[PDB]
Every structure is written in C-alpha cells, then in structure tokens.
Design an enzyme around this catalytic site. Structure first.
Site, PDB file in Angstrom:
ATOM      1  N   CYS A 156      54.772  46.501  -6.749  1.00  0.00           N
ATOM      2  CA  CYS A 156      56.109  46.903  -7.175  1.00  0.00           C
ATOM      3  C   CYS A 156      57.249  46.371  -6.297  1.00  0.00           C
ATOM      4  O   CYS A 156      57.330  46.668  -5.093  1.00  0.00           O
ATOM      5  CB  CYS A 156      56.210  48.429  -7.245  1.00  0.00           C
ATOM      6  SG  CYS A 156      57.839  49.021  -7.765  1.00  0.00           S
ATOM      7  N   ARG A 161      60.448  49.082  -4.766  1.00  0.00           N
ATOM      8  CA  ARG A 161      60.139  50.176  -3.847  1.00  0.00           C
ATOM      9  C   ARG A 161      61.226  50.639  -2.873  1.00  0.00           C
ATOM     10  O   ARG A 161      61.055  51.671  -2.217  1.00  0.00           O
ATOM     11  CB  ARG A 161      58.857  49.867  -3.074  1.00  0.00           C
ATOM     12  CG  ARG A 161      57.608  49.916  -3.946  1.00  0.00           C
ATOM     13  CD  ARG A 161      56.399  49.632  -3.106  1.00  0.00           C
ATOM     14  NE  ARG A 161      56.146  48.201  -2.967  1.00  0.00           N
ATOM     15  CZ  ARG A 161      55.360  47.682  -2.033  1.00  0.00           C
ATOM     16  NH1 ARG A 161      54.790  48.478  -1.135  1.00  0.00           N
ATOM     17  NH2 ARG A 161      55.157  46.369  -1.982  1.00  0.00           N
ATOM     18  N   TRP A 197      63.786  51.690 -13.956  1.00  0.00           N
ATOM     19  CA  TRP A 197      64.502  50.860 -14.924  1.00  0.00           C
ATOM     20  C   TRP A 197      63.830  49.490 -14.935  1.00  0.00           C
ATOM     21  O   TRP A 197      63.053  49.177 -14.039  1.00  0.00           O
ATOM     22  CB  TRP A 197      65.988  50.733 -14.565  1.00  0.00           C
ATOM     23  CG  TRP A 197      66.207  50.333 -13.132  1.00  0.00           C
ATOM     24  CD1 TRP A 197      66.084  49.074 -12.591  1.00  0.00           C
ATOM     25  CD2 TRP A 197      66.578  51.200 -12.052  1.00  0.00           C
ATOM     26  NE1 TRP A 197      66.370  49.110 -11.237  1.00  0.00           N
ATOM     27  CE2 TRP A 197      66.676  50.401 -10.888  1.00  0.00           C
ATOM     28  CE3 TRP A 197      66.851  52.572 -11.961  1.00  0.00           C
ATOM     29  CZ2 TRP A 197      67.013  50.933  -9.649  1.00  0.00           C
ATOM     30  CZ3 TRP A 197      67.200  53.098 -10.732  1.00  0.00           C
ATOM     31  CH2 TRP A 197      67.273  52.279  -9.588  1.00  0.00           C
ATOM     32  N   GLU A 207      60.927  41.223 -17.051  1.00  0.00           N
ATOM     33  CA  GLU A 207      59.814  41.918 -17.698  1.00  0.00           C
ATOM     34  C   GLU A 207      59.983  41.865 -19.206  1.00  0.00           C
ATOM     35  O   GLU A 207      59.012  41.738 -19.953  1.00  0.00           O
ATOM     36  CB  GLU A 207      59.762  43.380 -17.250  1.00  0.00           C
ATOM     37  CG  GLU A 207      59.491  43.548 -15.762  1.00  0.00           C
ATOM     38  CD  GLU A 207      59.352  45.010 -15.397  1.00  0.00           C
ATOM     39  OE1 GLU A 207      58.239  45.560 -15.578  1.00  0.00           O
ATOM     40  OE2 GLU A 207      60.359  45.609 -14.978  1.00  0.00           O
TER      41      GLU A 207
HETATM   42  C1  HEM Z   1      63.427  51.712 -10.193  1.00  0.00           C
HETATM   43  C2  HEM Z   1      63.156  50.589 -10.884  1.00  0.00           C
HETATM   44  C3  HEM Z   1      61.868  49.865 -10.792  1.00  0.00           C
HETATM   45  C4  HEM Z   1      61.735  48.516 -10.939  1.00  0.00           C
HETATM   46  C5  HEM Z   1      62.869  47.556 -11.222  1.00  0.00           C
HETATM   47  C6  HEM Z   1      60.358  48.196 -10.798  1.00  0.00           C
HETATM   48  C7  HEM Z   1      59.868  46.898 -10.925  1.00  0.00           C
HETATM   49  C8  HEM Z   1      58.528  46.652 -11.166  1.00  0.00           C
HETATM   50  C9  HEM Z   1      58.006  45.458 -11.734  1.00  0.00           C
HETATM   51  C10 HEM Z   1      58.842  44.288 -12.191  1.00  0.00           C
HETATM   52  C11 HEM Z   1      56.646  45.560 -11.788  1.00  0.00           C
HETATM   53  C12 HEM Z   1      55.629  44.559 -12.358  1.00  0.00           C
HETATM   54  C13 HEM Z   1      55.554  43.238 -11.582  1.00  0.00           C
HETATM   55  C14 HEM Z   1      54.768  42.183 -12.339  1.00  0.00           C
HETATM   56  O1  HEM Z   1      54.430  42.374 -13.546  1.00  0.00           O
HETATM   57  O2  HEM Z   1      54.447  41.108 -11.745  1.00  0.00           O
HETATM   58  C15 HEM Z   1      56.343  46.833 -11.247  1.00  0.00           C
HETATM   59  C16 HEM Z   1      55.046  47.248 -11.124  1.00  0.00           C
HETATM   60  C17 HEM Z   1      54.806  48.541 -10.709  1.00  0.00           C
HETATM   61  N1  HEM Z   1      55.698  49.500 -10.380  1.00  0.00           N
HETATM   62 FE1  HEM Z   1      57.597  49.408 -10.206  1.00  0.00          FE
HETATM   63  N2  HEM Z   1      59.652  49.317 -10.595  1.00  0.00           N
HETATM   64  C18 HEM Z   1      60.485  50.379 -10.543  1.00  0.00           C
HETATM   65  C19 HEM Z   1      60.166  51.737 -10.371  1.00  0.00           C
HETATM   66  C20 HEM Z   1      58.875  52.232 -10.195  1.00  0.00           C
HETATM   67  C21 HEM Z   1      58.509  53.581 -10.050  1.00  0.00           C
HETATM   68  C22 HEM Z   1      59.481  54.728 -10.133  1.00  0.00           C
HETATM   69  C23 HEM Z   1      57.130  53.635  -9.817  1.00  0.00           C
HETATM   70  C24 HEM Z   1      56.278  54.832  -9.609  1.00  0.00           C
HETATM   71  C25 HEM Z   1      56.707  56.005  -9.099  1.00  0.00           C
HETATM   72  C26 HEM Z   1      56.662  52.279  -9.845  1.00  0.00           C
HETATM   73  C27 HEM Z   1      55.360  51.864  -9.652  1.00  0.00           C
HETATM   74  C28 HEM Z   1      54.944  50.587 -10.055  1.00  0.00           C
HETATM   75  C29 HEM Z   1      53.516  50.303 -10.209  1.00  0.00           C
HETATM   76  C30 HEM Z   1      52.359  51.244  -9.973  1.00  0.00           C
HETATM   77  C31 HEM Z   1      53.422  49.030 -10.623  1.00  0.00           C
HETATM   78  C32 HEM Z   1      52.141  48.269 -10.917  1.00  0.00           C
HETATM   79  C33 HEM Z   1      51.586  48.589 -12.307  1.00  0.00           C
HETATM   80  C34 HEM Z   1      50.244  47.933 -12.568  1.00  0.00           C
HETATM   81  O3  HEM Z   1      49.421  47.702 -11.656  1.00  0.00           O
HETATM   82  O4  HEM Z   1      49.931  47.629 -13.740  1.00  0.00           O
HETATM   83  N3  HEM Z   1      57.755  51.473 -10.038  1.00  0.00           N
HETATM   84  N4  HEM Z   1      57.497  47.496 -10.837  1.00  0.00           N
HETATM   85  C1  LIG Z   2      57.400  52.021 -13.360  1.00  0.00           C
HETATM   86  C2  LIG Z   2      57.566  50.670 -13.732  1.00  0.00           C
HETATM   87  C3  LIG Z   2      58.857  50.151 -13.820  1.00  0.00           C
HETATM   88  C4  LIG Z   2      59.012  48.811 -14.179  1.00  0.00           C
HETATM   89  N1  LIG Z   2      60.242  48.290 -14.266  1.00  0.00           N
HETATM   90  N2  LIG Z   2      57.939  48.045 -14.466  1.00  0.00           N
HETATM   91  C5  LIG Z   2      56.676  48.521 -14.394  1.00  0.00           C
HETATM   92  C6  LIG Z   2      55.570  47.668 -14.688  1.00  0.00           C
HETATM   93  C7  LIG Z   2      55.404  47.533 -16.207  1.00  0.00           C
HETATM   94  C8  LIG Z   2      54.321  46.695 -16.655  1.00  0.00           C
HETATM   95  C9  LIG Z   2      53.832  46.927 -17.939  1.00  0.00           C
HETATM   96  C10 LIG Z   2      52.790  46.156 -18.472  1.00  0.00           C
HETATM   97  N3  LIG Z   2      52.335  46.402 -19.720  1.00  0.00           N
HETATM   98  C11 LIG Z   2      52.225  45.135 -17.707  1.00  0.00           C
HETATM   99  C12 LIG Z   2      52.712  44.866 -16.424  1.00  0.00           C
HETATM  100  C13 LIG Z   2      52.115  43.852 -15.640  1.00  0.00           C
HETATM  101  C14 LIG Z   2      51.730  42.552 -16.369  1.00  0.00           C
HETATM  102  C15 LIG Z   2      51.052  41.677 -15.487  1.00  0.00           C
HETATM  103  C16 LIG Z   2      49.683  41.493 -15.664  1.00  0.00           C
HETATM  104  C17 LIG Z   2      48.966  40.651 -14.820  1.00  0.00           C
HETATM  105  C18 LIG Z   2      47.599  40.476 -15.007  1.00  0.00           C
HETATM  106  C19 LIG Z   2      49.621  39.985 -13.789  1.00  0.00           C
HETATM  107  C20 LIG Z   2      50.988  40.199 -13.638  1.00  0.00           C
HETATM  108  N4  LIG Z   2      51.642  39.578 -12.649  1.00  0.00           N
HETATM  109  N5  LIG Z   2      51.654  41.025 -14.470  1.00  0.00           N
HETATM  110  C21 LIG Z   2      53.749  45.660 -15.902  1.00  0.00           C
HETATM  111  C22 LIG Z   2      56.474  49.852 -14.025  1.00  0.00           C
END
Ligand code: HEM
Ligand SMILES: Cc1cc(N)nc(CCc2cc(N)cc(CCc3cc(C)cc(N)n3)c2)c1
Ligand code: HEM
Ligand SMILES: Cc1cc(N)nc(CCc2cc(N)cc(CCc3cc(C)cc(N)n3)c2)c1
Ligand SMILES: [Cl-]
Ligand SMILES: [Cl-]
Lengths: 362, 362
Positions: free
Chosen positions: B65, B68, B237, B242
């Site tokens: 994430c 953070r 948000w 994304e």
């Molecule tokens: C406040 C705005 C937030 C933004 C802009 C944000 C941004 C992101 C983004 C862009 C990703 C995915 C990265 C990728 O696909 O390569 C992500 C993953 C994640 N975020 Fe955040 N996030 C936010 C808030 C949160 C919150 C509130 C939590 C939990 C309390 C959280 C927990 C996570 C987790 C667990 C993932 C990984 C999900 C997975 O493994 O599939 N995020 N975040």
């Molecule tokens: C709380 C929170 C807020 C926020 N803004 N964004 C998220 C993550 C949302 C998310 C949703 C999906 N369906 C897949 C991915 C990863 C897709 C993906 C898959 C693999 C395999 C690699 C990679 N880099 N990304 C991320 C969570």
C-alpha cells in the site's frame, strides 16, 4: 580450493554445453583433458566452440534482459590473442564498427584474455565503449552526470573534454604490468549519433537532443565454466525507453522532462495534469521516430515484450527453466500494458552469465 | 497448540501496542488477564483501544500500500456486537455512507465478530462492497469480467442483473448457521459514481465511461494479536491509475484503450507510435479531472508517491523498520518518475496485517 571451484564449474559447463551442441559423447575425454590441464597449469583454455556457445548461454541466462529471444545469434569475436595496447584499442574500434554495421546493429561480444589468478590481463575503465562525459563544478552541470567520476579520472590522465553536453569519452583501459591506463580518442567516423526530432512537433528540435546509436557495455565480467573474462564488451540495440525514460528523462541524468513539456506546449505545474507522463510519452515517441528515420536499429517496449514472450515459450518448449528479474524486465513506460507485468519470474542465478565487478577507479 | 499460537501472538501485539500508546506499565496485568481468559474460553477479547490501534497498525504494515502515510487517522467502527443479517446489512450500508461522506472520502474500517475456532460468524462474499457485475455467455461479454464468478453465484441465489456494463452487485454474505448467503440490493442514493470526461477532448464523453467513488475491500482478513477478523471491510480513496490503468484499461477488465485511442484521434495500428501509452495517459488525465470536477476524493500517483516518501521518513524518525513490496508500490504509469522505483524495500510480513483468505464460492 580455487582449483576445485574451477574444476566443478568446468564439469557443469562442459556437460551442459556439449549436450546442447549434440556433443555429449565427447564430454568424457574433454573433461579428462581439462583435469590434466588444471593440475598442470592451474587453469584451462576454452575451444572456440565452447567460448562462443558460453557467451550465448550467458546472454540467455541474463535475468534482467528483455532482449534474450535472440541469444543464439550473438556474434562472438575471439580476441584472446591480444597482447598489446594497440591490439586492444584496434579490437575495440573494430567492435564498434562491426556492431554498428552502418546502423543495422549486430549484437556482438569481443572477448579478451581472461583473468589468470584473479590477475586481469586487460582492465577496461569505460562503462560503455561509447558514452558522454559529465562535469559538475561550482554548481555548473554539463553532460551526463553518470559519467562524472570516470570523466574526472580521464582528466587526471592528460585528457581534456570540450565541455559540450555530448563529449565522447575516450577509450580508457589498463594493461597488466602498467601502473596507469592509456586513453584513446574515438574516431568520430566510427560513432553513429541520432538527433532527436518529433514526428508531429516541429519545435522538438529546439531541444537539440541527440543520443549515440549503440550501447556497448564494457564493464561487466563474462563467466564461463569457471573462467573469468573480466574484459568482454557486448552490445545489443536499444529499447527506446532506455533513451527516452532513463538517459534523457531521469533527474540524475539529462533531466529533460520540463523542457520537453515546454516544447510540446503543456504546463508543468500540477501533478494532476500528469504532465510528466505526457512528456515521457512524447519524448519516447520522438526517440523511436528518430532512430527509425535515421536507419539505426531500435525496438519499442511493446514489440520487445512480445519477443520476450516468445523467448519464454521457446524455453518451455526446449525443457529449459526460465529465469528473470521482474523489476528489470518491466519497461518504465506503461509496464502493465505488457504481459511481463502480469506474471512472476524465478530470479535464480544460472551460469554462464554476466556479472558486476569492482570499478578500477573512484 | 492453537492456544499457544494465540498466546504468543497476543504477547507480541499487546507489548507493541501498549508501548506505542504509552501504556507499557499496564502490559503486565493485561497479559495476565488475557492468559486466564484463553485458559478459560479458548480465546480473548480486545479492548476498543486495542482493536482500533490494531487495525491502524495493520494498515501501517501493509507492504503493498502506497497510501500508508495516513495510517493513524483510520476511522475504526467496532461492530463486534452484530448478531443478525439485518444488523450486518445495516452496518455495511452505514460504512458506505460514512466512508463516502458526500465525496470527501474517509478511510474507514468496520470490524465484525471474529472467527471463533476458525468458524466464521459473518462471511462476506463480495470482493468490494461496491463493484460492477460481469457476464460472459455465447461469446458475449458485458460488464466487469473480474466479477463473472461472483455474479454467476448471485444469480443462483435469485438475483438477476440488468446486464448493463455497470450493474451494481448486491451485498452478499452468509451468517453462521445458515446454509446460504443472503443478498441485498444497494440503495442507489448511497453509491456515488463519477462519469468520465476529459478536460480538453469533448468527444471523450462518447465512451460513456464511469466508475464508482469508493473502493471498499471486503474479502480480506484483519489479524490482530492472534485474533482473526475475517469480516472487516476497509476503504481508502482511489489512486487514479487504479481506475485508468487497471480497471478501465486492462484487457481482462474493461479493455478500453482502443476506444480511447479513437476518441483522442490517434491511430492504434503501430507499436512504435506508442498509442497505448498515449491513450493510457489521456485516460488517466480524464479520470483525475472527472473525480476532481465532481468533488470526489482521489490522488494522482506523483502526489501519492510523495506522501509515501514522507511515510518512509516518518518510519525512520520513529525508529520503526519499513516494509514494502516494490512490485505493488510502483505505479503502473511512469513508475521511474517516482522515488519508489529507484530504491528497494524489505518485503517482510509484520503483524497486525491484512491477509488473503479463501473465497466461499467458486
Ligand atoms: C487513503 C487512500 C488509499 C490509497 C490511495 C491507497 C492506495 C493503494 C493502492 C494503489 C493499492 C494497490 C497497489 C497496486 O495494485 O499495485 C493499495 C493496496 C492496498 N492497500 Fe491501500 N490505499 C489507501 C488506503 C488503504 C486503507 C485504508 C487500507 C486498510 C486499512 C489499505 C490497505 C491496502 C492493502 C491491504 C492493499 C493490498 C491489497 C492486496 O494485496 O490485494 N489501503 N493501496
Ligand atoms: C483500501 C484500498 C484502497 C485503494 N485505493 N486501493 C486498494 C487496492 C485495490 C485493488 C483491487 C483489486 N481488485 C486488485 C488490486 C491489485 C491488482 C494487482 C494484482 C497483481 C497481481 C499485481 C499488482 N501489482 N496489482 C488492488 C485498496
Ligand atoms: C539485442 C538487443 C537488446 C535489447 C533490446 C536489450 C534490452 C535490454 C534492456 C532494456 C536492459 C535493461 C533493463 C532495465 O534497465 O530495466 C537490458 C539489460 C541487460 N542486457 Fe540486454 N538487450 C539486448 C542485447 C543484449 C546482449 C547482446 C547482451 C549480452 C550478450 C545483453 C545482456 C544484458 C545484461 C547483462 C543486462 C543487465 C545489465 C545490468 O545488470 O546492469 N543484452 N537489456
Ligand atoms: C547489452 C545491452 C543492451 C541494451 N539495450 N541495454 C543494456 C542495458 C543498459 C543499461 C545501462 C545502464 N547504465 C543502466 C542500466 C540499468 C539501469 C537500472 C538500474 C536499476 C537500479 C534498476 C533498473 N531497473 N535499471 C542498463 C545492455
Ligand atoms: Cl544506456
Ligand atoms: Cl479497484
């Protein structure tokens, strides 16, 4: 235990190499010859066939390289016979000429005598055979910042750069027995450069950007069957993003994105405008257009990834494990538009391979 | 040994949590209370303070994430008191309303009763609380392909989608003791959507694209001090990429890049034209513009990376080790323009944290 490391690497290499060459029946006698030679001399000498295939395997095992589909067509030049600085210089000039090939770039490696007992016979100082100098003094920055330390070292050896943004560094290398490296200016007739223009935006030429045609990495060590070829420069052709998203765009390199934004007529004021992203795309479009217009080989990252997909398929079809470094294989522009981004790779080290080595200067 | 795993996790969590809360003197007595409770009941119950800080630490430890920096302002809603489907439904509706906050999005987590002995009390089927349905039959593809399996499962439960490209899936969850999940349609008044327009290109609206305002992940497990909160949906948000580089652009998702290229007036014929890259930038510019124009929170990847840099600095200043997954932290658009690309991260798993769990359907 130096010898045992050597013998063990030799056994694994010769078995694998001869198997691929359909020469498996000869492995037995060849290894016996090698064992005697090590016992006697402390080392062994590759056949031309072994050296050539070894350099090809080393490319095939280079985890960070997206260009590996073409591993088996590497042009290997055996220069283990050189003994003098003039011969080394002439071999480097020749590499540039034959790799450049009037713009139709040939992936080529020139292999010099290997380390004897960790003792280098030839020590190349350049990072690439063709690269631009860099200067920083009194807050004034000129040329390629990546070359600052090497440029300063060159200027300790009696060389002087003109201090344009694109001074060609001389070849610089040291022979065994000599305390100081020698340097030789590159004949400009050998060095193809490409001016950067944009297909639609006439003003792009106001930036007066250019880059050199052929990236020839000259600071890595080729290791084949326990033999250390510390001096073995190799080249491919560029992938466009290397020039447009790294060399010209990076803040610690030529840092041109603000200037690019200005000439393409967009503001460079707000992160939400994605002006850096837009400038990066246009600079990268300009790079590909310019190399193509000049008739100098280049590949775009989409085509390169598609070629790499075929490399993966070829490996599977041959029964070879695939190794790769995801962090280097993804292109720095639209990575998620390539298949590479959406899978994982085993980053294990397989030999023969190319390796980093300590710089001979600071 | 279930209990010993629990006791060991509890000890580490309580010590760390109370230390951060300046409550270190109370660790001793609290752990004694916990040990008795485990001996007695097989488990233990978090104080509100422990639960809240635990959910915050879990976000702080989420390696993937980029968002953070804001971990400590997470809004934690304690719903360990729910016992009925109506209460669960109403709590999910409430989460949507309060997280949405008329567009000024509040990062929020709602925490339901935890697993008892691996036995779930509440089992949420949705991947996100708000998401679009997907359909594929007779070669005809409609909506979000990522939702195809869940959509088919919903339609086994008596639900029927309108088969637009943007049908809202109902909430679907199962209570302990029930054989089948129940489903509830989302009140549209609760769900903010944003139509996608471009700041300069009028024709972009011809694509009739939109996306929902708030991503609320509802299929992960929150683990705090050995307690498994399998049902604990959370939201932030969006980062613009994304939506613009994944949800709308991916070939296995909405797959809109060719259509984007057409409306922005470029050919989609040659890899060397970098049309995919150009379309990606314009789609991503449109996404940011549209959310901003509507007054719905969003962040661009440059600003997000700068915030993450501050998170790194804050961690160092607090004496906390930083963990991260480089492969997820880099944005999929111009990654090398962020500082993240140019450093490495320790991808070690630290608890409390959020984890994947098996889906309850296929
Ligand atoms: C406040 C705005 C937030 C933004 C802009 C944000 C941004 C992101 C983004 C862009 C990703 C995915 C990265 C990728 O696909 O390569 C992500 C993953 C994640 N975020 Fe955040 N996030 C936010 C808030 C949160 C919150 C509130 C939590 C939990 C309390 C959280 C927990 C996570 C987790 C667990 C993932 C990984 C999900 C997975 O493994 O599939 N995020 N975040
Ligand atoms: C709380 C929170 C807020 C926020 N803004 N964004 C998220 C993550 C949302 C998310 C949703 C999906 N369906 C897949 C991915 C990863 C897709 C993906 C898959 C693999 C395999 C690699 C990679 N880099 N990304 C991320 C969570
Ligand atoms: C034919 C055209 C070639 C192309 C387009 C190509 C492409 C690339 C690119 C783009 C990278 C860097 C990736 C990044 O920075 O993330 C790279 C790295 C590399 N390539 Fe290739 N390559 C080619 C030929 C070769 C050849 C001929 C060799 C050796 C025989 C080679 C060996 C390597 C090695 C060793 C690296 C990693 C360098 C390092 O660790 O610093 N490549 N290649
Ligand atoms: C033979 C050959 C042909 C060809 N077309 N390209 C190369 C690679 C050239 C190259 C040259 C430099 N100076 C730095 C990098 C990596 C820069 C870099 C550094 C770090 C740390 C991460 C990353 N992803 N990339 C690559 C070799
Ligand atoms: Cl380079
Ligand atoms: Cl999403």
């Amino acid at each position: 235990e130096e010898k045992e490391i050597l013998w063990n690497e030799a056994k694994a290499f010769i078995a694998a190499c001869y198997q691929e060459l359909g020469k498996a029946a000869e492995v037995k006698d060849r290894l016996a010859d090698i064992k005697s030679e090590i016992d006697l001399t402390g080392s062994y000498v590759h056949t031309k066939e072994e050296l050539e295939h070894g350099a090809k395997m080393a490319w095939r095992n280079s985890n960070r390289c997206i260009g590996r589909l073409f591993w088996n067509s590497l042009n290997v030049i055996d220069r283990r016979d050189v003994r003098t600085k003039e011969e080394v210089r002439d071999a480097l000039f020749h590499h540039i000429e034959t790799a450049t090939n009037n713009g139709k770039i040939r992936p080529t490696i020139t292999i010099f005598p290997p380390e004897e007992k960790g003792e280098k016979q030839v020590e190349i100082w350049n990072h690439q055979l063709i690269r631009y100098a860099g200067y920083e003094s009194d807050g004034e920055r000129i040329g390629d910042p990546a070359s600052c330390s090497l440029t300063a070292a060159c200027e300790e050896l009696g060389w002087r750069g003109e201090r344009t943004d694109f001074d060609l560094l001389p070849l610089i290398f040291r022979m065994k027995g000599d305390e100081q490296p020698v340097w030789y200016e590159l004949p400009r007739s050998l060095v193809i450069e490409v001016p950067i223009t944009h297909p639609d935006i006439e003003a792009f030429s106001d930036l007066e950007l250019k880059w050199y045609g052929v990236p020839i990495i000259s600071d890595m060590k080729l290791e084949v069957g326990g033999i250390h070829y510390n001096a073995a420069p190799f080249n491919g052709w560029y992938m466009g993003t290397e020039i447009g998203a790294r060399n010209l765009a990076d803040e610690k390199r030529y840092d041109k994105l603000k200037k690019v934004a200005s000439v393409i007529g967009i503001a460079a004021d707000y992160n939400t405008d994605l002006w850096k992203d837009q400038a990066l795309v246009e600079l990268n479009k300009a790079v590909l257009h310019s190399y193509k217009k000049q008739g100098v080989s280049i590949v775009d990252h989409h085509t390169a990834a598609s070629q790499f997909k075929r490399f993966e398929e070829q490996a599977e079809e041959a029964g070879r494990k695939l190794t790769g470094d995801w962090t280097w294989l993804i292109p720095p522009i639209s990575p998620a538009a390539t298949h590479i981004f959406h899978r994982s790779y085993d980053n294990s080290i397989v030999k023969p391979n190319y390796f980093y080595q300590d710089k001979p200067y600071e």
